[PDB]
Amino acid sequence: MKPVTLYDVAEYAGVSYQTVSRVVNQASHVSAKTREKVEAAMAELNYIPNRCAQQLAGKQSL
Amino acid sequence: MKPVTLYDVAEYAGVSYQTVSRVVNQASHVSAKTREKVEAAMAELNYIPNRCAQQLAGKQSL
DNA sequence: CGATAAGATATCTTATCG
DNA sequence: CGATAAGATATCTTATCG
């Protein structure tokens, strides 16, 4: 079950992954609008606490 | 400083990485003793990934 | 069936530019 | 100081062989 990736929030926010990922990791070096955009994005997409693979993994393409 | 990796468990179990890696994710087509050693290995070595961002800060210095 | 190797994707880290 | 781009590493999944 992989609903959202930090990439998803990033895209939805309109910012690089580590734009928002940096935000999610502390965001000690960013701007106002950015945090609010990522915050909005993750909020809308719900964004579960599993960007990488803490207690749930799996990935495929093509 | 870097804790266990699936490679560590793999080596310690005496099985290729891809063997135990698939084990930890399903282990559909795997023998008995194999599961025992992978499980043992990860158990003995404790096995803590930390491939995200918990306490493992310094990783690669480029 | 069980084990090994290769390919693809995501996350994080570091460096550069405005 | 802040955002973007490139590179490296690890994990996961699928296919083939004995």
What is shown here, in short?
With 62 residues, the first copy, chain A, is mainly α. Chain A has helices spanning 6-13, 17-25, 32-44.
Summary keywords:
Lactose operon repressor (chains A, B), Lac repressor, DNA-binding, 434 Repressor (Amino-terminal Domain), homodimer, transcription/dna, 3 helices, 62 residues, mainly alpha
Please characterize this protein's 3D structure.
Chains A, B: It comes from Escherichia coli (strain K12). Chains A, B: This is Lactose operon repressor. Chains A, B: Homotetramer. Chains A, B: Repressor of the lactose operon. Binds allolactose as an inducer. The structure is a homodimer of 62-residue chains. With 62 residues, chain A is mainly α. Chain A has a single domain, classed as 434 Repressor (Amino-terminal Domain). Helix content of chain A is 48%, strand content 0%. Chain A has 3 helices and no strands. The two termini of chain A are 18 Å apart. At the A-B interface, loops of A face loops of B. Chain B binds a DNA duplex (18 and 18 nucleotides) through helix 2.
Draw up the topology in text:
Two copies of one chain form a homodimer.
Chain A: H1 6-13, H2 17-25, H3 32-44
Helix pairs in contact in A: 1-2, 1-3
The structure holds a DNA duplex (18 and 18 nucleotides).
Roughly how many Å is the radius of gyration of chain A? 12 Å
Fourth CATH level, the homologous superfamily of chain A = lambda repressor-like DNA-binding domains
The domain tally of chain A reads 1
| Residues in β-strands, percent of chain A | under 5%
Distance between the termini of chain A: 18 Å
User: Given the C-alpha coordinates, what overall shape of chain A results?
Assistant: elongated
Number of strands of chain A: 0
Q: Helix count of chain A?
A: 3
Query: Briefly, what CATH class of chain A?
Result: Mainly Alpha
Task: Tell me the series of helices and strands of chain A, N- to C-terminal.
Answer: HHH
Which percent range fits the helix content of chain A? Answer: 40-55%
Secondary structural class of chain A: mainly alpha
Q: Tell me the greatest interface.
A: A-B, 7 and 4 residues
CATH-scheme architecture of chain A: Orthogonal Bundle
Largest sheet of chain A: none
For this entry, what is the oligomeric state of its chains?
homodimer
CATH topology of chain A: 434 Repressor (Amino-terminal Domain)
